[PDB]
Structure formats: structure tokens, C-alpha cells
Design an enzyme around this catalytic site. Structure first.
Site, PDB file in Angstrom:
ATOM      1  N   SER A   7      41.917  30.700   4.404  1.00 46.31           N
ATOM      2  CA  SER A   7      43.246  31.289   4.431  1.00 46.31           C
ATOM      3  C   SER A   7      43.298  32.727   3.989  1.00 46.31           C
ATOM      4  CB  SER A   7      44.225  30.469   3.586  1.00 46.31           C
ATOM      5  OG  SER A   7      44.636  29.314   4.310  1.00 46.31           O
TER       6      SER A   7
ATOM      7  N   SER B 194      50.438  29.527   1.399  1.00 44.54           N
ATOM      8  CA  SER B 194      49.354  29.253   2.343  1.00 44.54           C
ATOM      9  C   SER B 194      49.765  28.257   3.419  1.00 44.54           C
ATOM     10  CB  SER B 194      48.077  28.794   1.649  1.00 44.54           C
ATOM     11  OG  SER B 194      46.979  29.101   2.523  1.00 44.54           O
TER      12      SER B 194
ATOM     13  N   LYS C  30      45.095  35.341   6.214  1.00 41.25           N
ATOM     14  CA  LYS C  30      46.540  35.490   6.303  1.00 41.25           C
ATOM     15  C   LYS C  30      47.033  36.826   5.766  1.00 41.25           C
ATOM     16  CE  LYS C  30      46.941  30.465   6.254  1.00 41.25           C
ATOM     17  NZ  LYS C  30      47.302  29.201   5.537  1.00 41.25           N
TER      18      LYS C  30
ATOM     19  N   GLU D 108      44.644  27.631  12.699  1.00 36.70           N
ATOM     20  CA  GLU D 108      44.627  26.545  11.709  1.00 36.70           C
ATOM     21  C   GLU D 108      44.744  25.213  12.429  1.00 36.70           C
ATOM     22  OE1 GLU D 108      44.105  26.726   8.647  1.00 36.70           O
ATOM     23  OE2 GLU D 108      44.620  28.706   7.976  1.00 36.70           O
TER      24      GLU D 108
END
Ligand code: CL
Ligand code: CL
Length: 263
Positions: free
Chosen positions: A47, A107, A50, A143
């Protein structure tokens, strides 16, 4: 040299007990100097990508190519694992700003996929990384598939050096307008997922903005802007992959890197 050698030493010794590889970048904004461990090795982002995604949204806003108030509708079929905010708004949608906030501070995985879909996906984000001078980072999947972290697989990876340079450019440098870089800093400071990583290891008087990542094959990461007391800000990237110790120990290793950066 002594600070570089001491940190590289402490990282080698932590890495030895972890079972995997530990990559650390420390960029001191007072000097422009970077120290760390495995600075140019490849690690799965998980993550941590991001931050680049939110950065690209804001860079598009700066160019009037995106609007933070634009509403995105989506379906149950868009929901992937670990989507605490987006799973509550299937019926009413979310704005681009709300999606960025959820992707950074919680997240949220579907939120990140909706941001990826707004700007050309993994290839669009990789092109933004190239615009920052980063020839290393690559995002390939969305994802949750990008968290696989297979040994040696270059998909969905960065290096501690590359990501530290990108995080500096997006927060303290000039890749984003003053309004947008402040907004990204605000989201990073409001992160809720990092309490057992760098935040736990740095001195409590420091201010922290961070983004974690966690994935398969013992992968645990944290990237941060750190504001010491009466010392220039630091950018710190920590990537651990292939760890064979339990998850709680991976968190402690990252916290202990945070302590070593400060000491
Ligand atoms: Cl442009
Ligand atoms: Cl690079």
C-alpha cells in the site's frame, strides 16, 4: 560516514534475525544527503503506492484535469478485501477527495482502485513516477493482487532511494502546488495504520506523516516525513520483505529502524 556506517550496521543486524531483506532510506533535507541500507534494491510496495496515487490525483487537480469534489459511483463488484470506508458508500458514492483520504489514512483498497481507474491505472501511476525522475518504481496490478510479493518478482516494486526521493518531491519539494503538497501532508499526518511502525520508534516530540504497506511473504513497509524538534525534516523509507518472523516482530523491526534514525 559514522552515521551512515552505524545505521547500515544496525540494519544488517536487524535484517539477520528477520529472515528477509531490509531496505532503509534516510534523506536529510538539511543536506540533501541519503543514507540507509539496500538503497537501490527492489522491494514490493504494497500500500505504499497509494502516496504516489494521491500525489498523481493532486497533480491532475493542479492542472485542472481532476476535481477533488467530483463524485464517483461504484458497485459492490468493485469492493475488494480491506475497504472500510468504500464498503459503506456503495449507495451514495464518494468524492475524489474522500477516496484519497480513505486510501491514505485507512489504506482502503477499493478507494485506491477507484483512484487508479481515474488516471490510467498502474501504467498511469508508473508514468507519474517517471515524471518525478524515478526510473525504478513500477506498478503493474491493482488491489489486492499487487500484494503477492513473490520472491524476485519486479512487478509492483520500488527501492528505498526512489520512494524517498518521490516522497520528498511530493511533500517538501515542488512536484505539487503549495495547496496540494499541504493537502498530501495533512492526509499523511492523519494516517491511522502506522502506530506500531515508525511512529512507535521515533521520539514522541517529533511530528510524523506516514503510509504503511503490508503484504505476502513477510512484507511490511512504512514511509514517512518526519519533523524533528529544531532539526530539518527527514524522509524515511522502510521496506522489509521475505521476513520469516511473525508479523508483530516485523512491526517492531520497523519501529527499531525509526529509533535508529533518530539516535
Ligand atoms: Cl504536464
Ligand atoms: Cl530512480
Amino acid at each position: 560516514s559514522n552515521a551512515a556506517d552505524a545505521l547500515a550496521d544496525m540494519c544488517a543486524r536487524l535484517e539477520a534475525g528477520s529472515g528477509g531483506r531490509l531496505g532503509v532510506g534516510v534523506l536529510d533535507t538539511a543536506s540533501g544527503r541519503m543514507i540507509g541500507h539496500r538503497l537501490d534494491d527492489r522491494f514490493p510496495m504494497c500500500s505504499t503506492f497509494k502516496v504516489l496515487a494521491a500525489g498523481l490525483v493532486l497533480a491532475r487537480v493542479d492542472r485542472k484535469q481532476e476535481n477533488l469534489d467530483r463524485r464517483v459511483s461504484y458497485a459492490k463488484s468493485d469492493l475488494v478485501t480491506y475497504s472500510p470506508a468504500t464498503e459503506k458508500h456503495v449507495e451514495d458514492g464518494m468524492t475524489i477527495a474522500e477516496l484519497c483520504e480513505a486510501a491514505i489514512t485507512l489504506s482502503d483498497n477499493t478507494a485506491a482502485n477507484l483512484l487508479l481507474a481515474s488516471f490510467g491505472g498502474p501504467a498511469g501511476l508508473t508514468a507519474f513516477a517517471r515524471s518525478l525522475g524515478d526510473e525504478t518504481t513500477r506498478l503493474d496490478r491493482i488491489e489486492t493482487e499487487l500484494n503477492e510479493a513473490l520472491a524476485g518478482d519486479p512487478r509492483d516494486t520500488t527501492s528505498p532511494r526512489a520512494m524517498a526521493q518521490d516522497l520528498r518531491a511530493l511533500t517538501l519539494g515542488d512536484a505539487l502546488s503549495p495547496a496540494s503538497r499541504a493537502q498530501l501532508i495533512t492526509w499523511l499526518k492523519a494516517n491511522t495504520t502506522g502506530g506500531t511502525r515508525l511512529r512507535a520508534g521515533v521520539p514522541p516530540g517529533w511530528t510524523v506523516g506516514d503510509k504503511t504497506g503490508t503484504g505476502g511473504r513477510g512484507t511490511a513497509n512504512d514511509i514517512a516525513v518526519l519533523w524533528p524538534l529544531q532539526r530539518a525534516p527527514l524522509i524515511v523509507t522502510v521496506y522489509l520483505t521475505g521476513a520469516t518472523v511473525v508479523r508483530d516482530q516485523q512491526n517492531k523491526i520497523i519501529a527499531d529502524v525509526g529509533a535508529a534514525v533518530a539516535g
